[PDB]
């Protein structure tokens, strides 16, 4: 089997992407944030504290003839941005882009943190990291990918995120029309439960490529590119008037600037992030200070190849016995 679903930016900045997901019988379609940096499929629901719901579509398990309470199971998750959610668990039928899993753990939120409530466009998350990170207790649950895997034509999924445009998540096949050149595959460590890999270096604009190992994770659920402070300083030094602002919480730059590109290495291959991808717009409405899309990972304890990086590539998440990542230009 295969599946193919379109993913759509939630706003003009590509702050996140949402993908429609069918849950239950009859289907309830929720728009979920596919997150290769976590392993829980959780949803706003009929159980979510009413004051914490503001415009999201909810899953109502009592209206699904295939929903079953997973007795005694609870979940609770905290993300890198400080947000969190928790609740109880149902199993139900979940379909993505025509690919169906029966008996998927659907984590129903009783509580969500303010950043979730305030984002009316995201109805929950669908985790695509390794199932070792799933938070369900006392019986850990499998991701949608892990439950689908054995049925797929190939044990893979691909992320093809758009710049200010829709893109695609495919399950079970490579769309050879969706990228240019060849796919470069690189090793993955699953030791932290992430799609963790090592970039071979970087370049700023038309500058020379610096060969250096950068360990980090491919994380579709993170907006920005978080890299070591040395790399990030080297990038923003090429933008007149850019500075790190402790008050704003990262590098800012004059909105009048034209940003240089950023290249990262994948083995001997190179992915180029156009400068425009690095502009996250005014820090507050009407400001002439703009927020940068490349930020320091110092204090986060891992480098994160978030959407700024991934949307410059066609990315293969290869879930074979030994997982690997693939990157192609597009
Ligand atoms: Na921000």
UniProtKB/Swiss-Prot annotation:
Q: Which reaction does it catalyse?
A: Hydrolysis of proteins with specificity similar to that of pepsin A, prefers hydrophobic residues at P1 and P1', but does not cleave 14-Ala-|-Leu-15 in the B chain of insulin or Z-Glu-Tyr. Clots milk
Q: Which residues form the Peptidase A1 domain?
A: 17-328
Q: Does the keyword Translocase apply?
A: no
Which protein family is it in? Belongs to the peptidase A1 family.
List residues traversing the bilayer.
Answer: none
**Species whose genome carries this gene:** Cryphonectria parasitica
What is the main EC category here? hydrolase
| Intrachain disulfide bonds | 255-290
Name recorded for this polypeptide: Endothiapepsin
Q: Which residues form the active site?
A: 35, 199
Q: Which residues of the full protein are shown?
A: 90 to 419 of 419
Q: Keywords assigned by UniProt?
A: Aspartyl protease, Disulfide bond, Hydrolase, Protease, Signal, Zymogen
EC assignment: 3.4.23.22
Q: Which GO terms describe its molecular function?
A: aspartic-type endopeptidase activity
Instruction: List GO BP terms, alphabetically.
Output: proteolysis
């Amino acid at each position: 089997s295969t599946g193919s679903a379109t993913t759509t930016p939630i706003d003009s900045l590509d702050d996140a992407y949402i993908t429609p997901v069918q849950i239950g019988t009859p289907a309830q379609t929720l728009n979920l944030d596919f997150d290769t940096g976590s392993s829980d499929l959780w949803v706003f629901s009929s159980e979510t504290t009413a004051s914490e719901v503001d415009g999201q579509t909810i899953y109502t398990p009592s209206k699904s003839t295939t929903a079953k309470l997973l007795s005694g199971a609870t979940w609770s998750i905290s993300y890198g941005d400080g947000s969190s959610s928790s609740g109880d668990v149902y199993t139900d039928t979940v379909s993505v882009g025509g690919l169906t899993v029966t008996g998927q753990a659907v984590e129903s939120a009783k509580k969500v943190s303010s950043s979730f409530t305030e984002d009316s466009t995201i109805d929950g998350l669908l985790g695509l990291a390794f199932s070792t990170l799933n938070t369900v207790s006392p019986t850990q649950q499998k991701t949608f990918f892990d439950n689908a895997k054995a049925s797929l034509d190939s044990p893979v999924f691909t992320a093809d995120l758009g710049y200010h445009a829709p893109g695609t998540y495919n399950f079970g096949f490579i769309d050879t029309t969706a990228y240019t050149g060849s796919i470069t595959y690189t090793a993955v460590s699953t030791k932290q439960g992430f799609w963790e890999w090592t970039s071979t270096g970087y370049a700023v604009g038309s500058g020379t490529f610096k060969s250096t190992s950068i360990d980090g994770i491919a994380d579709t659920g993170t907006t920005l590119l978080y890299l070591p402070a040395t790399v990030v300083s080297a990038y923003w030094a090429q933008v007149s008037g850019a500075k790190s602002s402790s008050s704003v919480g990262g590098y800012v730059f004059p909105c009048s600037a034209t940003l240089p590109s950023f290249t990262f290495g994948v083995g001997s291959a190179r992915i180029v992030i156009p400068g425009d991808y690095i502009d996250f717009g005014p820090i507050s409405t009407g400001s002439s200070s703009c927020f940068g899309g490349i930020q320091s990972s110092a204090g986060i304890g891992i480098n994160i190849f978030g959407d700024v990086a991934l949307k410059a590539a066609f990315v293969v998440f290869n879930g074979a016995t030994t997982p690997t990542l693939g990157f192609a230009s597009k």
